[PDB]
């Protein structure tokens, strides 16, 4: 493995691989 930028959908794709789609919540920003 190597460290890389993962913005937006790319972060969710990595949580998907790390957790196995089990139940993550990334705390997306609520501000307008």
């Amino acid at each position: 493995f190597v460290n890389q930028h993962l913005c937006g959908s790319h972060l969710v794709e990595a949580l998907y691989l790390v957790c196995g789609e089990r139940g993550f919540f990334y705390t997306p920003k609520t501000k307008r």
Partner: peptide, 21 residues
């Protein structure tokens, strides 16, 4: 939070494991 940190800088699997349940 990881959703901004991994956009603005390089990410890690150790840091992402905090958000899984």
């Amino acid at each position: 939070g990881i959703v901004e940190q991994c956009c603005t800088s390089i990410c890690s699997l150790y840091q992402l494991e905090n958000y899984c349940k």
